[PDB]
Amino acid sequence: EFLKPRLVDIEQVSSTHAKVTLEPLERGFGHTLGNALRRILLSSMPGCAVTEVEIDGVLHEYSTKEGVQEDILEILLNLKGLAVRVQGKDEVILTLNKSGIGPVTAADITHDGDVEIVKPQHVICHLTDENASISMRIKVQRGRGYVPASTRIHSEEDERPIGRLLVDACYSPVERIAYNVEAARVEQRTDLDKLVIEMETNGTIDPEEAIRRAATILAEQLEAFVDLR
Amino acid sequence: GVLKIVKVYLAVKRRIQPGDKMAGRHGNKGVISKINPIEDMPYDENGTPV
């Protein structure tokens, strides 16, 4: 009696912008599903983000690094917005070492097979002295939402004072979601429509996987109502 | 009677929370009622919230 929706087009216009078409949907289900999926996407899409940083020769973020154009606070802020895709692990430790004149970008982190840098042109900082050598350890975890550094605390609440440069984690890989319900020229019915979800993300998530995860979350939540006791 | 003076500087982050006074440049001061989740926020036709 109802025509179930199905993925009919996943257009990847760019690495961070994708159009996904669902067809067909009956009248009213288009807006319902669009709003439900948009909210689940914006709310509960997991991802990976920079959590802890430990630069050598640095005690706290309220200090200056030698021969570096930007403050350590600015460096941590730039590392907050680093788009990293991690496969197979929920806790990875990257190492970035650099020296000499030049912009230290995202392409200079020591390469590992389980980690991918979506945007190698992301400028982390700059070096302005030939002898200036920078070396940092970046801990990346897989999480969901936004966990500010002030709330999360160490397991035993006692960690290296010199390190523990805690960066606020914005785990959400998606930044903008629109959805449109448009008339489809179906030769069988005339009340059918199509749901175009236009997604703009950080490039770290596969749009089809994200939509399937959102649908799984929605179904698991509705299972409590369906299985009622 | 003063032998040694040790001055210690403490730096603390202060993040916006319900209650902080925020204003424009026109006297339109107000108080943060709550932090509304991004999906609950109104969005325009392009999906860009406010």
Side-chain angles (χ1 to χ4, degrees), chain A residues 166-187:
Chain A
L166 282 172
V167 184
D168 281 344
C170 297
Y171 288 124
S172 178
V174 192
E175 74 184 6
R176 186 174 61 85
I177 301 148
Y179 60 90
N180 276 81
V181 176
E182 290 181 358
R185 292 190 187 178
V186 181
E187 71 279 4

Side-chain angles (χ1 to χ4, degrees), chain A residues 50-55 76 79 136-138 163-165 167:
Chain A
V50 168
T51 62
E52 311 187 294
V53 184
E54 184 179 1
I55 306 174
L76 290 183
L79 286 175
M136 62 194 86
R137 297 180 187 83
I138 306 168
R164 197 209 280 268
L165 289 179
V167 184

Side-chain angles (χ1 to χ4, degrees), chain A residues 39 62 73 150 176 179, chain B residues 13 15 40 43 46-48:
Chain A
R39 290 174 63 85
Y62 295 115
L73 190 138
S150 55
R176 186 174 61 85
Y179 60 90
Chain B
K13 294 286 189 182
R15 189 175 65 254
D40 283 23
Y43 58 97
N46 280 331
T48 299

Side-chain angles (χ1 to χ4, degrees), chain A residues 35 38-39 42-43 61-62 73 146 148-151 168 175-180 198, chain B residues 9-15 37-50:
Chain A
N35 199 67
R38 171 184 192 280
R39 290 174 63 85
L42 284 176
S43 77
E61 56 192 2
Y62 295 115
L73 190 138
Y146 157 57
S150 55
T151 65
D168 281 344
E175 74 184 6
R176 186 174 61 85
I177 301 148
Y179 60 90
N180 276 81
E198 202 176 19
Chain B
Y9 276 43
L10 271 296
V12 190
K13 294 286 189 182
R14 295 193 188 282
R15 189 175 65 254
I38 187 64
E39 75 274 8
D40 283 23
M41 287 301 276
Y43 58 97
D44 72 328
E45 69 185 314
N46 280 331
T48 299
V50 302

Side-chain angles (χ1 to χ4, degrees), chain A residues 82 103-109 117-126:
Chain A
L82 180 76
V104 179
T105 60
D108 313 318
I109 296 90
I117 303 297
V118 175
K119 196 171 189 294
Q121 294 84 16
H122 184 205
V123 173
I124 289 167
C125 55
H126 295 83

Side-chain angles (χ1 to χ4, degrees), chain A residues 67-79:
Chain A
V68 171
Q69 172 88 38
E70 292 90 2
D71 285 345
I72 292 162
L73 190 138
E74 179 43 60
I75 288 172
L76 290 183
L77 290 174
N78 267 347
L79 286 175

Side-chain angles (χ1 to χ4, degrees), chain B residues 1-5:
Chain B
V2 164
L3 298 173
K4 298 182 71 67
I5 294 172

